Amino acid sequence: KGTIIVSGGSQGLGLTTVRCFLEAGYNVATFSRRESPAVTELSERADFHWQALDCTDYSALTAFVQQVEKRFGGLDGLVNNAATGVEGILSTMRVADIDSALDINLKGQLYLTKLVTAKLLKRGAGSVVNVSSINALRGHSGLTVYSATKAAMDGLTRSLAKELGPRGIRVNSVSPGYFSSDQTLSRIERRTPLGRLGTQQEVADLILYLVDRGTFVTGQNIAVDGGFTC
Amino acid sequence: KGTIIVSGGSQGLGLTTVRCFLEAGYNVATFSRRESPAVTELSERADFHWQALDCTDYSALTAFVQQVEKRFGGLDGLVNNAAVEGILSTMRVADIDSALDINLKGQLYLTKLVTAKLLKRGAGSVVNVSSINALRGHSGLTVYSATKAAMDGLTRSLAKELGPRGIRVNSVSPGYFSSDQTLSRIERRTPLGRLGTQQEVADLILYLVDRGTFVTGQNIAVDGGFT
C-alpha cells in the first residue's frame, strides 16, 4: 500500500477521495485554506493528516511534503484535485481573475507535482492522478479560462508520463462529468446516456483503480461522466 | 481588406505566417520583444504594423490593440503564436513562473483584447498555434506541453462561446519543421519522412482564417503524420 497526498481534500470530491483511499488501506495526507470537520478524521481513520496551507506558496508546500514524509515514511502517489471554478465569458472577465485562476488552478498543481515527483523518484515507484474535467475535453461556453487550466494538466499528464515512466511511475487523468456536490438538471439528464448525475463515490472509485491496480495504464485521460462526452 | 494580428511575428514561423497573410491580401499587425530587420516591412507590403512589446503587460497590449484597431478600422482575426526543454525535477520554480506567464497568460490577455474587437464586427477567426507536444507527450517538455495544451482547451471552449457570434476558433499543431543533431529517428518516425517547412504550417493557418467557414473547435496537426 502506502501513502497518498490528496490536494483539496477538506470537502466535496477530494474528501470522498480521501475517505476512499483510507478504506482501501492507504495513509492519506491532505490540505486546504481552512479546516472543516476533517477534525473528525484528524483522530485517525487510517492515520490521516491534514494541514492549513496556501497552494500558491512553494516553501509552504515544501514543508508539508517534508512533514508528510516524516510522519509516514514514504510517498506512493498524488491526487491533484484542488481547483477553484471560474464561470463567465472572457469579455466580462476581470484581468485579476485570470491571474488567480492560473495561480490557484495550474501553478499550485505544478508545484505540488514537482515536489511529490521528487519523493516518488526516491522510492522508484508511484502513481499520480490529475483530476480534470469534461470541460477539458469538450468546451462549454463561459468556462474558457477554467478549461485552459484543466486541459493544461491533461497536457502535463501525457508528457510527465513519458518522463516518469522509465522510473516506474504511472500518470493519468480522470475527467469527471456532472456529479452531486454540496431545473436545467433536465437538459443534463437528457444528454447523459445514463440519464442521471454521477456520485462522488463513482469518481473516487475510478481514481482508486488507477492508483491501486492500474499497473499497465499510463498517459490516459478517462472520463467518468455517464457517457456525457462520448 | 481584412486585418489579422499575429503574435510574435518578427522571426521563424510568426514571420512566415505574416508574409503569407500580406501576400494573401490582408493587413497584418504584429509584435515581438525586439526588432530584427524585417523592418523592411515597415514601409508596408500590404500595410503592416509592427511594434516592440512585452506580451505579459496588459496596458501594453491594450495600447497595441486600440491603436491597431484605429489604424485599420477593425480586426478580422488573431493568430496566437508567441513562444523550452528540461525535466521537472531540475526545473527551477522561477522558470515554472515565467513559462506560465509568457506562454500562457500573455496569450489569454491578447485573446481577451482581440476577441472584444471581433465581437464588434460580428465575424472572425482565431487560430491558436499549438504543438504536437500538446497532443502526444514528450519527456522534458512537461511545462511547455501544459501551456500548449492549455491553449487547446481554450480553443474548444472559446469556439462554443464566440461561435454564436460568428467567430470560429481553431488550433493548428505543427510537428517538426526547419527553423533558423543527427536525429533522423524523427525522419523514420514521420510517415512522410521529412521535416516540414514553415510555408506548409502557415498555409494551414491561412486556410483556417481565410476560408474554413464551417470549421471550428478543431485542432489540426501539420506534422507529416507523426502523431
The 3-class SS string of chain B reads: CCEEEECCCCCHHHHHHHHHHHHCCCEEEEEECCCCCCCHHHCCCCCEEEEECCCCCHHHHHHHHHHHHHHHCCCCEEEECCCCCCCCCCCCHHHHHHHHHHHHHHHHHHHHHHHHHHHHHCCEEEEEECCHHHCCCCCCCHHHHHHHHHHHHHHHHHHHHHHHHCEEEEEEEECCECCCCCCCHHHHCCCCCCCECHHHHHHHHHHHHHCCCCCCCCEEEECCCCC
Phi then psi dihedrals of residue B170, to 5 deg: -150, 150
**DSSP SS3 for A27:** strand
For residue B169, CA distances in Å to A136, B83, B127, B217 come to 16, 19, 6, 6
Number of neighbouring beta carbons within 10 Å of residue B198: 20
Task: Give one DSSP letter per residue of A216-230, joined into a string.
Answer: T--S-EEEESTTS--
Catalytic site includes residue A146: yes
Side-chain-facing half-sphere of B224: CA atoms under 13 Å: 17
What does the DSSP 8-state code read for residue A104? I
**DSSP SS3 for A164:** helix
Q: How many Å apart are CA A84 and CA A143, to the nearest integer?
A: 12
Q: How many Å apart are CA A182 and CA A186, to the nearest integer?
A: 19
Residue A149, all three cell numbers: 487550466
Cβ–Cβ below 8 Å for B157 and A150? no
Query: What stretch of H or E contains A85?
Result: none
Resolution limit, Å: 2.7
Query: What stretch of H or E contains A172?
Result: strand A169-176
- Which strands sit side by side in the sheet containing B27-32, from one edge to the other? B48-52, B27-32, B3-6, B77-80, B124-129, B167-174, B219-222
Q: Within the 69-108 window of chain A, which residues sit less than 8 Å (CB to CB) from chain B?
A: 89-91, 93, 95, 98-99, 102, 106-107
Domain B1-227 of CATH type 3.40.50.720: yes
Residue B51's DSSP bridge partners are B31
Of the candidates A90, A107, A158, the beta carbon closest to that of B136 is on: A158
Cβ–Cβ below 8 Å for A219 and B58? no
Number of neighbouring beta carbons within 10 Å of residue A97: 13
CATH of domain A1-230: 3.40.50.720
Residue B24's DSSP bridge partners are none
Q: How many Å apart are CA A47 and CA A180, to the nearest integer?
A: 27
Note the residue count of chain A.
Answer: 230
Method used to determine the 3D structure: X-ray
Q: How far is B39 from chain A (nearest CA, A)?
A: 32
Q: How many Å apart are CA A80 and CA A133, to the nearest integer?
A: 12
Phi then psi dihedrals of residue A174, to 5 deg: -120, 125
Of the candidates A90, A93, A155, the beta carbon closest to that of B150 is on: A155
- Per the listing, cell 501594453 goes with B60
Sign of the four-CA dihedral B181, B184, B189, B195: positive
Number of neighbouring beta carbons within 10 Å of residue A115: 22
Residue A221's DSSP bridge partners are A173
For residue A141, CA distances in Å to A150, A165, A223, B42, B164 come to 15, 36, 19, 39, 10
Residue B147, all three cell numbers: 501551456
Q: How many Å apart are CA A150 and CA A129, to the nearest integer?
A: 13
Q: How many Å apart are CA A226 and CA A229, to the nearest integer?
A: 8
Residue A61, all three cell numbers: 508546500
What does R_g of chain A's alpha carbons equal in angstroms?
17
